[PDB]
Amino acid sequence: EIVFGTTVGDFGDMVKEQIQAELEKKGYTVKLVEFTDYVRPNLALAEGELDINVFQHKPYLDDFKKEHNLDITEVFQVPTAPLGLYPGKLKSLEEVKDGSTVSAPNDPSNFARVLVMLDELGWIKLKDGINPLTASKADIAENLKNIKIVELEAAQLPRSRADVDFAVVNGNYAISSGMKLTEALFQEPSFAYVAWSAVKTADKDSQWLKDVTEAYNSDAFKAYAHKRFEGYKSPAAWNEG
């Protein structure tokens, strides 16, 4: 038996709908433990109550295992609900004007991700040599297109598209509000916040983990993810697949 821990939602659905049967074909059984918060999964992993968890991105994992002194590590990436720039009052990227408004989530990590995206688009230029994970308005070296960024609560972003020219919406709120991820005009190119699986470090070279990694990178899983999770950001190793 391989004991998976996930949050309730997409990451558990991957286990239940595709990964479980794939690993059954390889001699294993899969036991899914669902968690409703983000603190317990790594602790349960570290105490040996889980063999692997799939819920978090690497910035979160790094901070968590540092602060709790856990001997755990990321293993592989999984398809992840993406941060996207969606149409607002304007309907395409080249309609952007000097002074165009962009709504964005106001929590510091998501806001930093928005700034990095706008820098990739060429609408702003961030200072050089900064930590992209903590980018803030102070780090804008040149506002190329004089964009006005309207900071709102993440949950409010789906309703802002009448108020601003473009809206940056988190994948989770895009999904829960009925938006299609494929509607985004521009999806976050960075992989810095794609979700990873995690294990105890002592287990990182184990045979069962090689088989789990294979299952999460198999052709069957890829086709499943392309149908079930259209628009999600794929693991880098899939080559945009």
Author numbering: 44 to 284
Reproduce text from the manuscript describing this model.
With the exception of MetQ found in the MetNIQ complex, the structure of substrate‐free MetQ has not been reported. Since MetQ has a high affinity for l‐methionine, preparation of the apo‐MetQ requires cycles of unfolding and refolding to remove the bound ligand. As an alternative approach, mutation of Asn229 to Ala (N229A) in the binding pocket of the E. coli MetQ was found to substantially decrease the affinity toward methionine, thereby greatly facilitating preparation of the substrate‐free form of MetQ. Despite extensive efforts with both approaches, we could not crystallize the substrate‐free form of E. coli MetQ. Structures of the substrate‐free (N238A) and substrate‐bound N. meningitides MetQ are related by a “Venus‐fly trap” hinge‐type movement of the two domains accompanying methionine binding and dissociation. l‐ and d‐methionine bind to the same site on MetQ, and this study emphasizes the important role of asparagine 238 in ligand binding and affinity. As this asparagine residue interacts with both the α‐amino and α‐carboxyl groups of l‐methionine, mutation to alanine would be expected to significantly impair ligand binding. Three distinct conformational states have been characterized to date for MetQ: one liganded and two ligand‐free forms. A thermodynamic analysis demonstrates that ligand‐free MetQ associates with the ATP‐bound form of MetNI ∼40 times more tightly than does liganded MetQ, consistent with the necessity of dissociating methionine from MetQ for transport to occur.
